[PDB]
Amino acid sequence: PAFLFSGSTLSSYRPNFEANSITIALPHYVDLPGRSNFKLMYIMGFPIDTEMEKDSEYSNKIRQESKISKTEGTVSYEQKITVETGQEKDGVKVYRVMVLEGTIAESIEHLDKKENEDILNNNRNRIVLADNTVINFDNISQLKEFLRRSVNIVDHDIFSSNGFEGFNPTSHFPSNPSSDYFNSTGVAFGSGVDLGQRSKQDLLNDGVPQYIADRLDGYYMLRGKEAYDKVRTAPLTLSDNEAHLLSNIYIDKFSHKIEGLFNDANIGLRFSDLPLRTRTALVSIGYQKGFKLSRTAPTVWNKVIAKDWNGLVNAFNNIVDGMSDRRKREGALVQKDIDSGLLKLH
């Protein structure tokens, strides 16, 4: 491949090549500690990954291709990845390792480095997952989008869209006196960020920038009629930029609460092992109804902890609550992950 030894490689693996040895300038062979089949050849200081249909020693066997979509898919945000660049022909693959078992965030910055432009531009780019399956990309921009997608715990664009939580940067009152939660509801901003039971210090503690927290002074702790009257007589509108920044903080916060409960349930997999759309669906219903789904949506939670994905879709479709259309849309996200083969039925 062109520019094969150009740029730099990011590695969590440190080989221990003794200096002073006379075997410098010779290729070195290591099997990756936790893996098989995963033999590497170090030429210069660089990891080379070779796959050959015809089995040699000093080479790997053809790795299976992943089912994950290069255009829409994600890898677990809790897994390390190996990113490679190179060429293939006639049952022969020669790949330079650009990132060796790095975190997703590390990979994004590493692949953005100027020194790595040439090589990533002039070769095929792929990811070797921890399960040894491989994802092939059309170009490096696409892989970079895939990684940036993968760091997200939920799809924030889907979440804040009209069919789900929605988005309104103007102070609004999302309730009415006939509701049992009229007096529990406060002034909301952006995607359902309710200040009725929050103070400025609360938002600061949650990581909201001081400039946004300060702007919301006057709207904290207002509930029921007082929240209603405040919106009516003295509304405040945040910029879309500030309102999304605020919304995403709380979307992420409650994503992590639900993740915590999912993982504490000891289901046989972690929240990060769920595909993006399914995570988004669960957080969507949790965000609106209450994150403790074992109480707020028991039929949904029961199916989740049973790994009954068809049953999960059915549970969403059969919630009776006054937000039927949204519940169905949440169920449809899960169904799409089932249809894409991302949720193993069993």
Side-chain angles (χ1 to χ4, degrees):
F3 306 105
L4 190 76
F5 299 104
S6 63
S8 59
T9 288
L10 182 59
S11 187
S12 64
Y13 176 76
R14 309 167 191 261
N16 295 329
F17 296 148
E18 323 262 77
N20 296 129
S21 77
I22 58 178
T23 70
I24 314 295
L26 301 195
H28 308 104
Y29 304 91
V30 349
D31 290 343
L32 203 55
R35 324 274 298 266
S36 88
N37 86 129
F38 209 124
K39 181 178 296 188
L40 291 182
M41 171 174 49
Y42 282 79
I43 299 172
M44 318 300 294
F46 298 110
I48 302 302
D49 192 331
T50 49
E51 279 176 56
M52 293 199 315
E53 178 72 11
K54 326 298 175 294
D55 183 41
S56 168
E57 285 56 276
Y58 129 111
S59 186
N60 291 309
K61 340 276 175 280
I62 309 291
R63 291 184 183 96
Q64 186 108 7
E65 187 172 15
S66 171
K67 95 221 316 302
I68 299 175
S69 161
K70 77 196 175 195
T71 51
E72 297 185 74
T74 45
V75 59
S76 163
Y77 52 86
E78 286 185 308
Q79 280 186 357
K80 297 177 178 304
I81 57 172
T82 292
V83 180
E84 299 178 357
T85 190
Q87 297 286 347
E88 304 172 27
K89 58 181 59 174
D90 287 309
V92 150
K93 324 201 176 196
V94 175
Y95 278 90
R96 152 82 180 276
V97 179
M98 296 307 298
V99 176
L100 184 53
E101 284 173 335
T103 65
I104 305 177
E106 274 178 344
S107 297
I108 295 175
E109 298 302 315
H110 177 80
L111 296 172
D112 275 349
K113 287 161 194 158
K114 176 64 173 139
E115 48 171 3
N116 293 326
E117 290 193 2
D118 282 345
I119 196 181
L120 302 169
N121 278 341
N122 296 281
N123 296 279
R124 307 186 109 175
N125 301 285
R126 72 176 192 171
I127 287 166
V128 186
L129 307 165
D131 70 348
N132 271 269
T133 55
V134 300
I135 306 175
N136 308 280
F137 293 88
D138 307 331
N139 58 69
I140 191 54
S141 176
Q142 184 189 74
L143 190 151
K144 290 175 174 179
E145 291 179 18
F146 182 96
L147 295 185
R148 290 187 195 276
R149 185 181 307 116
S150 300
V151 300
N152 291 291
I153 184 163
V154 304
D155 191 320
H156 300 79
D157 290 335
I158 291 179
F159 194 96
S160 298
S161 76
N162 199 45
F164 295 86
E165 186 67 13
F167 179 80
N168 182 2
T170 297
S171 62
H172 56 279
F173 184 76
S175 188
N176 74 97
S178 69
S179 320
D180 293 336
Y181 302 113
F182 174 76
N183 284 303
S184 296
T185 310
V187 181
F189 286 90
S191 302
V193 182
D194 190 319
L195 307 181
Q197 298 165 206
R198 290 188 171 99
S199 63
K200 173 156 71 177
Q201 192 61 59
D202 285 328
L203 268 62
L204 292 176
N205 293 345
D206 292 329
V208 179
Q210 186 81 53
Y211 57 86
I212 293 177
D214 285 348
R215 205 188 305 279
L216 300 179
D217 279 332
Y219 300 90
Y220 295 110
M221 297 293 186
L222 301 183
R223 294 187 303 278
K225 179 188 177 74
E226 290 76 19
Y228 172 93
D229 281 341
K230 184 73 185 196
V231 160
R232 184 176 53 84
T233 68
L236 166 75
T237 304
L238 301 181
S239 66
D240 272 19
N241 274 33
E242 283 194 348
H244 282 298
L245 204 156
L246 177 67
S247 300
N248 289 343
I249 284 178
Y250 283 94
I251 294 168
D252 289 353
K253 178 182 194 188
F254 284 86
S255 293
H256 287 299
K257 283 183 171 293
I258 292 165
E259 168 184 53
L261 292 177
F262 183 98
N263 295 339
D264 287 350
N266 292 325
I267 302 167
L269 63 314
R270 291 170 63 80
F271 199 67
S272 64
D273 293 318
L274 299 179
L276 182 66
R277 291 176 295 215
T278 296
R279 302 197 300 250
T280 306
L282 292 176
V283 173
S284 173
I285 184 168
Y287 195 89
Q288 174 178 60
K289 298 184 84 68
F291 71 95
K292 190 170 173 183
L293 294 168
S294 69
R295 171 181 74 80
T296 65
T299 60
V300 167
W301 189 250
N302 290 344
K303 292 298 179 266
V304 169
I305 64 183
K307 293 178 293 191
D308 183 4
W309 311 121
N310 278 324
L312 178 52
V313 171
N314 180 73
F316 272 111
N317 290 343
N318 285 282
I319 304 286
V320 182
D321 69 350
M323 289 294 275
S324 178
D325 296 327
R326 175 175 174 176
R327 300 286 89 87
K328 261 68 160 186
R329 283 187 289 263
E330 290 160 352
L333 290 178
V334 179
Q335 180 69 62
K336 250 159 46 177
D337 284 342
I338 295 173
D339 294 347
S340 304
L342 299 177
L343 289 169
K344 175 68 82 148
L345 293 183
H346 284 355

